[PDB]
Amino acid sequence: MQQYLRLKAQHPEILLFYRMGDFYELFYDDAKRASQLLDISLTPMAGIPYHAVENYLAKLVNQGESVAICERKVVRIVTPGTISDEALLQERQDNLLAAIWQDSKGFGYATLDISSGRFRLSEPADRETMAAELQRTNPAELLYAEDFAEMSLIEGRRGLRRRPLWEFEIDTARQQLNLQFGTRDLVGFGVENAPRGLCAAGCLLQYAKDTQRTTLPHIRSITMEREQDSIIMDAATRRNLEITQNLAGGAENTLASVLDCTVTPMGSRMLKRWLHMPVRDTRVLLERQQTIGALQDFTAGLQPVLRQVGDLERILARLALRTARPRDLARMRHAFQQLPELRAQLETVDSAPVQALREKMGEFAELRDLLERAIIDTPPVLVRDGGVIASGYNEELDEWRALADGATDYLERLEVRERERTGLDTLKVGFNAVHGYYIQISRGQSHLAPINYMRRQTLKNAERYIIPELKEYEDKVLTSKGKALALEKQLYEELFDLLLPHLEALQQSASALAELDVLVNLAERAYTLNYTCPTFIDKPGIRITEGRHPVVEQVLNEPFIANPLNLSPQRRMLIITGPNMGGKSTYMRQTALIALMAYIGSYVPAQKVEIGPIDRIFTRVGTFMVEMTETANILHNATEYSLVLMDEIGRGTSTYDGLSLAWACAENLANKIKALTLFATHYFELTQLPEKMEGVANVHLDALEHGDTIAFMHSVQDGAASKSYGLAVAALAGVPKEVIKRARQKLRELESIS
Amino acid sequence: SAIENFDAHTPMMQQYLRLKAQHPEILLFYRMGDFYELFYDDAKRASQLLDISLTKRGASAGEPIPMAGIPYHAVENYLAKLVNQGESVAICEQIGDPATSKGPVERKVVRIVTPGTISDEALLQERQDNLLAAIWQDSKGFGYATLDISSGRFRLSEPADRETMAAELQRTNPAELLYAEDFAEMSLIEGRRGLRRRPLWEFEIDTARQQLNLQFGTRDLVGFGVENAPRGLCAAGCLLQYAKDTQRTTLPHIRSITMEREQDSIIMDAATRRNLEITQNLAGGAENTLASVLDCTVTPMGSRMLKRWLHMPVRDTRVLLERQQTIGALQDFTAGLQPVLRQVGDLERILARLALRTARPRDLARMRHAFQQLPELRAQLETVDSAPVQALREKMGEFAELRDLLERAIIDTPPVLVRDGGVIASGYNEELDEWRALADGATDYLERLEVRERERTGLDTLKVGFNAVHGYYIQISRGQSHLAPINYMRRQTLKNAERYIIPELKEYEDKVLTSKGKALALEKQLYEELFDLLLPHLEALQQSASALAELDVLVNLAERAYTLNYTCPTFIDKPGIRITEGRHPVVEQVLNEPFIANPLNLSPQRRMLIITGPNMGGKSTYMRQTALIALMAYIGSYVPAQKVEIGPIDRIFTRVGFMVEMTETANILHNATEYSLVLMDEIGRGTSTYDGLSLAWACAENLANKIKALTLFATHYFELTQLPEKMEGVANVHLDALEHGDTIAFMHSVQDGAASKSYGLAVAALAGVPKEVIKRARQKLRELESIS
DNA sequence: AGCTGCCACGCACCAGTG
DNA sequence: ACTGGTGCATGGCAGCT
Ligand SMILES: Nc1ncnc2c1ncn2[C@@H]1O[C@H](COP(=O)(O)OP(=O)(O)O)[C@@H](O)[C@H]1O
Ligand SMILES: [Mg+2]
């Protein structure tokens, strides 16, 4: 095998698998890497088995690697951004492709979901907005121009794919895009005056087409994500809020873990999207609130039926790409059968948007009857070996199967004919690809074979024979099986012809069913978790009553202590002093999350929630350097509609430098920015603020001392903290009695002055 | 799911269930014919872990029995998959002969593979120890024992408190941890891998003594210095009872156990071991560790030894001065020894497999290759004037007799296993050459018989072949087969050939198949017989491997001391550290901007330095290098400096900044002594302004006045620069920085005195806090500055 | 070279016969 | 109590395109 590096040249940046019997083997830096990612030995060659290529392809793909299969030439290529088989895809997690680039004016950006067809473009102006979008969208594969100057954004990222500047050319991209969608201009989509981002979507759509070498009819539209259509959240804020991802890397004890009790995978992906994309436009919010309130009674009724629909989104993608396997068509049929029950249940629900999803759902009765008659109840995984088309769908196929079936029934009778004639109880008719049909006597009885029996194969304890009669029916069976298997393949391709016309309507359905799932779910969550419906006010403000952390109340097992919040423009900054130990931090995060959820359209963890409009949520809660950097970002971009959450800035540098930076930040946020702010500090000197300025108030956390421990209470109440707790804590940790005594003396000395 | 009494099973399952019952909690591979099998839930679990099909075995006792299995010849692949997941596997083989057996063939469990007892090349990592350990707790302290099962190293220790015990777990890092059912402090142990809850009786003391004594061939354990250590003996007894349960052979390489005393070595808490990144960085990787920079050893047994020394610095003034000499003496000779030393290889673990009677042909070949480098190492080391080196030349041995044994017994490149023969060589056993030479009736019978029969019959398709199932045969094509002598006896028929047998070939077939089986078994006798001849000299061989490893370590530390430019430190009587132009041995190599070397001077009258200076200044580095230079000087290595003078050091502590933070400080305050080196990297954490500092101030005083330890005490609290004024023994140093207005400047140089100003705003402005806010903070700061 | 399906094997599960 | 023949996990490799 000298001649194989000649195929490595064809695409160097992609790891090359190479058939070598029943395995795929790799060379050079494609071995070093493939052992460090997948875990396999390094003889420089590594290799996976053929029985689990899909397993090992998905793990490479999920680590942001394209693979190329070789069997000789390159027959297949998978890439992180463009896979659509259900074996390479995490069920409840979006898998986006993306392109990014940079003008002398700003950035362009586009994500594709190659299964839903969800195509978005944006145009981030500064680089922090850009980074926010990268964290949020979190694409499996990023395309980017060499051009690209600001490499620190995408520097450490899976699936980077360097593209030439000419692929990002505007005019070429407008056409390719207009051709894809069947429009003359891109005005129906809202993006015709949005060139930077159009150039990203141009590069992406062209890369996508290349990975598939097929039409992508399911991609029929594009939307632009505006900035002022959304509560902007920096990456450090999405991390600290643990919306979808705990700081620990995974998915436990996160907002989605508690709010996401949807019943279809497509509903789960959509909700997680909604949770990362709070919208500022109350019209849609009041629309969601009202739907959620309407479907509350109907939740037990709807969800068992909705669960049956399954992941129709991703199935429909495999219809669009013409790769759907028999079970895919079978689940599409199963889903269709739910639609009359879903439409019946939803019919009396008094909401305009629920009835609109009801219509959007469709019924598709013809396609239900088509697949009911065309496919058997539980068809094999593949079409390969037939057994998928139903009985009595195609009169011709039935004749062929009966010619086979009856030729096979002859050979069974041949068995019993030969058994009765020869009187040899071990006689049997078997079948095998190497020999066709055969009579088999055992070795003990083989010497008494009739002398018309032609010998063919000697086993250890048996002999095999053919006779003219046998081989006659071998043909009868095999031509009838071969023709019926050909008619099945053709009739299966004909089901795509009948299904594909209604591809658009089908995509509408799956989307409606994916939104019904989200809205019914959020409905169940509100009712089941004692949430209430928040109202919106004209000027900024957050009035909360007995509010809670939506996760911590569910995840811990101690009684969760609820608190109020009163932020108006006449009271826009609380100085939270006292012990933290999770208490302040929790109070602050439950504020953001409550706000986050009002603006997702969900009910919220509280007795009452009024809330003015919010444009950004900053949460600096988690070097001194990093703290000051995240603080710099708030002070540079916070507005008077911003929600700002600050966790004890100053620790990590000198008392005075730190006290002086806290003082100046709180001042700057109360007086200049005027953001609604929870400024959690430890500096007691900072409680003198509410006197020195308008619109600042003091609240605090306390601790109660009992027995020989201490209970860190979680009730925020008015006034400054009037106690400290580090000596008390050290005492209980068993720092020498005398040390603490001297510490208490020092502590008094130091306070007395200021 | 029926009543499944003894009588309810077949004879096969009765036997399976007795064996399984003596292994209820771990997977049992059960050798049935050509397969290792599993049943009931084990098969269900095996199907999920190993990725094999869950099947069944037909029954007449209710429902069917879940089964899974794997052909015997692939057992090792699957055994690996399980032990890397941390599963024990009991291996049960067939003992008897089925053809002389009424009921089921006899079956013993012959070994148990568990993560800490594995000793095969494929499941272990060249450069990383794989210890079994055993922990146990009393009302007053801990008992703890470790075992490298593939070397014999058997150690015993009796950690005083919870936190020394935490440090020992981190250090030894057992792949498997047997522990007592009554174990109170599960916080130390829960979460670890290879956890094995064990019943109390295994930790019973008189049974420990009896079993340990027995194993070492002694009447008491006085000579080993452990007779006084019942806490730890109880650990040792459980370990050893377990070790022997897993192996089910003698373990003659376990000829000793040693006490690991508090004061024989520098003791580092869990925090210190992590902050100096000795073999693991703070990501779990081995990149940019002390070990990455120092470990250019050529043999694996050397690498592991170096890593143990690094982790346990010895306090013995004599051993250190001798190791220090060995380095200096050997510096000229590394270039020539290192390539030879390499060729010895991993002799430690090869003598393991020899001792365990497991070693394969290629283990014996590499042992023979090792012996073949001792004569070159003997010459090389003679000219090195150093007593310690010549003691290691003597202890390395030579073993010319065994070299000549393996040179005459095994061939140059043997197969992986003896399973299939071809191992033993021509000359070694005369009976063996007789037997091969009959079954080497190749170059012989088959070819001529073929010609003769083709030419006599006149049938050109005629070939002579052998197939494993039908035996030897004469083949004729189907078109010529109706012409074959009526003497030919039809044997195997195919689609297009017929194969036949004649008396002459059948007689050659019985002759060659019995010749080959005889030749195989006698080979296996000869192979096993090498272990009998080798085994006596095992003690001397273990001392060989142990010297070759220490040579690899020292020769390494000498090369490192030349290339990286280190000098020999010297020791003193009272506590103190006096570094001249010292460097962080790791940071100095990763960075490219040359390393700003610094002094340090600790002493009993200058024992606590309060370190000040900016974020990113160099405070932590200056602490870590102090500790590393201590750590290195006390493994006998040379040190990254112009001159180092270091007195004695019992423990090293470390706090690097709630209920666990404070506890960590109490541990320091209670256990530090006048000989301890204490690093506190900005501690002091309260719920208010002055809270945490007040504690740090109180702690500082306590370390200076009461404990009198050598403390490096970096803070951001400027208030602590007043310490030197009040306490005795305290002083102020700082890592310098420069102004230039709008900009940074981190000079990385340590100088006496407090910093001139704290740089919190300068660093805040560098992060990009609005210049407008930095302004108002500077305004506030002179407000605050004007109080004093 | 690729693909199918016989065989390794001790043991248990039948039927068909003492 | 037989005689006799099946039929099994997986992986090696003969037999046959
Ligand atoms: N002696 C030195 N020479 C050159 N660089 C140094 C030196 N000491 C520290 N540094 C650099 O400073 C960085 C941080 O040092 P560090 O001690 O952590 O500052 P801090 O005092 O805030 O802990 C390190 O990453 C290292 O590169
Ligand atoms: Mg530091």
DSSP string, B128-194: B--EEEEEEE-SS-EEEEEEETTT--EEEE--SSHHHHHHHHHHH--SEEEEETT---TTTTTT-SS
For domain A531-754, the CATH superfamily is P-loop containing nucleotide triphosphate hydrolases (3.40.50.300)
DSSP string, B650-691: SEEEEEE--HHHHHHHHHHHHH--TT-EEEEES----SSTTH
Cβ within 8 Å of residue B118, ≥6 positions away: B83, B124, B130, B149
Strand-pair category, B651-656 with B577-582: unpaired
After which residues, if any, is chain B broken (C to N > 2.5 Å)?
Answer: 657
A81-107 burial: b if 16+ Cβ within 10 Å, else e: bbbbbbebbeebebbbbbbbbbeeebb
Note the CATH architecture for domain A94-229: 2-Layer Sandwich (3.30)
Closest CA to A112 of A223, A267, A266: A223
Closest CA to A290 of A602, A19, A63, A699: A602
Rounded Cα distance, A437 and A424, in Å: 19
Give the residue nearest to nucleotide C16 (CA to C1'): A425
Q: Which residues of B touch A736 (CB under 8 A)?
A: 666, 669-670, 702
- The reply, when asked if residue B619 is annotated as ligand binding, is yes
Closest CA to B651 of B633, B632, B674, B682: B674
Whether the CB-CB separation of A214 and A322 falls below 8 Å is answered with: yes
Residue nearest to atom 8 of ligand 1 (CA): B618
Cβ within 8 Å of residue B764, ≥6 positions away: A628, A653, A657, A661, B774, B777
The verdict on a CB contact (< 8 Å) between B693 and A750 is yes
Cβ–ligand 1 contact at B748 (below 6 Å): yes
What fold characterizes domain B399-534? MutS, DNA mismatch repair protein; Chain A, domain 3 (1.10.1420)
> Please, what is the Cα angle at A674 between A669 and A677, to 5 degrees?
60
Give the residue nearest to nucleotide C1 (CA to C1'): A21
Backbone angles phi, psi at A446, to 5 degrees: -65, -30
Give the residue nearest to nucleotide D16 (CA to C1'): A434
Q: What single-letter amino acid sits at A113?
A: D
Which residue among A658, A726, A739 places its CB closest to the CB of B691?
A726
Whole-number Cα distances in Å, A680 to A583, A586, A644, A691, B624? 10, 11, 11, 17, 34
> Please, what is the Cα angle at B233 between B227 and B234, to 5 degrees?
145
Count CB neighbours of B427 within 10 A. 10
Whole-number Cα distances in Å, B290 to A523, B265, B304, B313, B530? 57, 19, 14, 14, 42
CA of B480 to C1' of D3 (A): 39
- The reply, when asked if residue A583 is annotated as ligand binding, is yes
B105 touches strand C (CB under 7 A): yes
- Which contacts of B624-627 are long-range, i.e. CB under 8 A and separated by 24 or more positions? B624/B275, B624/B276, B624/B584, B624/B679, B625/B582, B625/B583, B625/B584, B625/B585, B625/B587, B626/B577, B626/B579, B626/B582, B626/B600, B626/B677, B626/B679, B626/B712, B627/B272, B627/B275, B627/B276, B627/B652, B627/B654, B627/B677, B627/B679
The verdict on a CB contact (< 8 Å) between B716 and A652 is yes
Q: What residues are paired with B90 via a beta bridge? A: B28, B112
Query: Could you tell me the distance, in angstroms and rounded to a whole number, from the CA of residue B681 to the centre of ligand 2?
Result: 7
Rounded Cα distance, B366 and B350, in Å: 8
Atom of ligand 1 nearest to the CA of B619: 21
Rounded Cα distance, B490 and A388, in Å: 47
The verdict on a CB contact (< 8 Å) between A654 and B718 is yes
Residue nearest to atom 18 of ligand 1 (CA): B620
- What is the Cα Rg of chain B in Å? 35
The 3-state DSSP class for residue A249 equals coil
Chain B nearest-CA residue for A625? B767
Whole-number Cα distances in Å, B151 to A171, A695, B349, B402? 72, 73, 6, 20
Closest CA to B128 of B93, B192, B161, B172: B172
CATH class of the A364-499 domain in this structure: mainly alpha
- What is the Cα Rg of chain A in Å? 34
Residue nearest to atom 11 of ligand 1 (CA): B618
Whether the CB-CB separation of A266 and A273 falls below 8 Å is answered with: no
Cα dihedral across residues B70, B72, B78, B79: positive or negative: positive
Which ligand is the nearest neighbour of the Cα of B759?
1
Whole-number Cα distances in Å, A438 to A154, A419, A421, A423? 65, 14, 17, 18
Residue A35's Cβ-count burial label (10 Å; 0-12, 13-18, 19+) is: middle
> Please, what is the Cα angle at B195 between B192 and B198, to 5 degrees?
145
Q: Does domain B129-264 have CATH number 3.30.420.110?
A: yes
Rounded Cα distance, B147 and B239, in Å: 8
Cβ–ligand 1 contact at B640 (below 6 Å): no
Given the structure tokens 């679990």, which residue do they identify? B45
CA of B35 to C1' of C9 (A): 8
- Please report which helix (H) or strand (E) contains residue A110, including its range: strand A107-113
| Three-state secondary structure string covering B712-774 | EEECCCHHHHHHHHHCCCEEEEEEEECCCCCCCCEEEEEEECCCCCCCHHHHHHHCCCCHHHH
The 3-state DSSP class for residue A299 equals helix
Strand-pair category, B176-180 with A96-102: unpaired
Q: What are the domain boundaries of chain B? A: 1-123, 129-264, 265-383+537-565, 399-534, 566-788
The verdict on a CB contact (< 8 Å) between A682 and B689 is yes
Q: What single-letter amino acid sits at B715?
A: T
Query: Could you tell me the distance, in angstroms and rounded to a whole number, from the CA of residue B623 to the centre of ligand 1?
Result: 10
CA of B310 to C1' of D11 (A): 46
Rounded Cα distance, B690 and A664, in Å: 20
Whole-number Cα distances in Å, B615 to A51, A380, A683, B766? 55, 65, 21, 11
Cβ–ligand 1 contact at B150 (below 6 Å): no
Q: What single-letter amino acid sits at A81?
A: G
A186-211 burial: b if 16+ Cβ within 10 Å, else e: beebebeebbbbbbbbbbbbbbbbeb
CATH no., domain A1-88 = 3.40.1170.10
Instruction: Copy the structure tokens of residue B354.
Output: 């020899």
CATH no., domain B566-788 = 3.40.50.300
Cα dihedral across residues B650, B655, B656, B660: positive or negative: positive
Whether the CB-CB separation of B249 and B238 falls below 8 Å is answered with: no
Count CB neighbours of B215 within 10 A. 20
Nucleotide nearest to B97 (CA to C1'): C10
Rounded Cα distance, A551 and A405, in Å: 61
Cα dihedral across residues B273, B277, B281, B283: positive or negative: positive
Residue nearest to atom 23 of ligand 1 (CA): B620
DSSP string, A625-680: HHHHHHHHHHHHH--TT-EEEEE-EEEES-HHHHHHHHHHHHHIIIIII--EEEEE
Given the structure tokens 């809850």, which residue do they identify? B197
B484 touches strand C (CB under 7 A): no
Q: Does domain B265-383+537-565 have CATH number 3.40.50.2300?
A: no
Whether the CB-CB separation of B297 and B552 falls below 8 Å is answered with: yes
Backbone angles phi, psi at B698, to 5 degrees: -60, -35
Count CB neighbours of B593 within 10 A. 6
CATH no., domain A230-348+502-530 = 1.10.1420.10
Rounded Cα distance, B196 and A536, in Å: 58
Whether the CB-CB separation of A628 and A664 falls below 8 Å is answered with: no
Give the number of C-alpha atoms closer than 13 A to the C-alpha of residue A393, restricted to the C-beta side.
21
Whether the CB-CB separation of A69 and A76 falls below 8 Å is answered with: yes
Residue nearest to atom 13 of ligand 1 (CA): B616
Whole-number Cα distances in Å, A149 to A104, A153, A633, B768? 10, 10, 22, 21
Closest CA to B704 of B621, B610, B623, B613: B610
Backbone angles phi, psi at B65, to 5 degrees: -105, 115
Rounded Cα distance, B598 and B582, in Å: 5
Q: What residues are paired with A144 via a beta bridge? A: A100, A162
Cβ–ligand 1 contact at B758 (below 6 Å): no
Cβ–ligand 1 contact at B617 (below 6 Å): yes
Rounded Cα distance, B214 and B208, in Å: 10
Whole-number Cα distances in Å, B365 to A626, B339, B345, B457, B624? 58, 19, 11, 50, 45
Rounded Cα distance, A63 and B346, in Å: 36
Rounded Cα distance, B112 and A145, in Å: 58
Give the residue nearest to nucleotide D9 (CA to C1'): B69
Closest CA to A674 of A566, A567, A537, A545: A567
A434 touches strand C (CB under 7 A): yes
Rounded Cα distance, B685 and A61, in Å: 45
Q: How near does any CA of chain B get to the CA of A633, in Å?
A: 8
Count CB neighbours of B771 within 10 A. 9
Rounded Cα distance, A211 and A78, in Å: 8
The 3-state DSSP class for residue A596 equals helix
Q: How near does any CA of chain A get to the CA of B246, in Å?
A: 28
Show which positions of strand D are touched by protein (CB under 7 A). Answer: 4-6, 8-12, 14-17
Whether the CB-CB separation of B304 and B291 falls below 8 Å is answered with: no
Closest CA to A653 of A690, A625, A677: A625
Whether the CB-CB separation of A99 and A122 falls below 8 Å is answered with: no
Q: What single-letter amino acid sits at A588?
A: M
Chain B nearest-CA residue for A657? B760
CA of B78 to C1' of C9 (A): 20
Q: What is the DSSP secondary structure assignment for residue B85, as one 8-state letter?
A: T
Rounded Cα distance, B423 and B416, in Å: 9
Cβ–ligand 1 contact at B759 (below 6 Å): no
- The reply, when asked if residue A584 is annotated as ligand binding, is yes
Rounded Cα distance, B111 and B647, in Å: 50
Solved how?
X-ray
- Give the CATH number of domain B1-123; options: 2.70.98.10, 3.40.50.880, 3.40.50.300, 3.40.1170.10: 3.40.1170.10
Strand-pair category, B598-602 with B577-582: antiparallel
Domains B265-383+537-565 and B566-788 share a fold: no
Q: How near does any CA of chain A get to the CA of B784, in Å?
A: 7
- Which contacts of A404-407 are long-range, i.e. CB under 8 A and separated by 24 or more positions? A404/A476, A404/A477, A404/A480, A404/A481, A404/A484, A407/A473, A407/A476, A407/A477, A407/A480
Q: What residues are paired with A163 via a beta bridge? A: A145
Strand-pair category, A608-611 with A542-547: antiparallel
Rounded Cα distance, A412 and A428, in Å: 9
Q: What residues are paired with B144 via a beta bridge? A: B135, B157
Instruction: Copy the structure tokens of residue A530.
Output: 């004692």
Atom of ligand 1 nearest to the CA of B749: 1
Backbone angles phi, psi at B511, to 5 degrees: -75, -35
Strands of A453-601, DSSP E: 454-458, 462-466, 535-536, 542-547, 563-567, 573-577
Q: What is the DSSP secondary structure assignment for residue A561, as one 8-state letter?
A: P
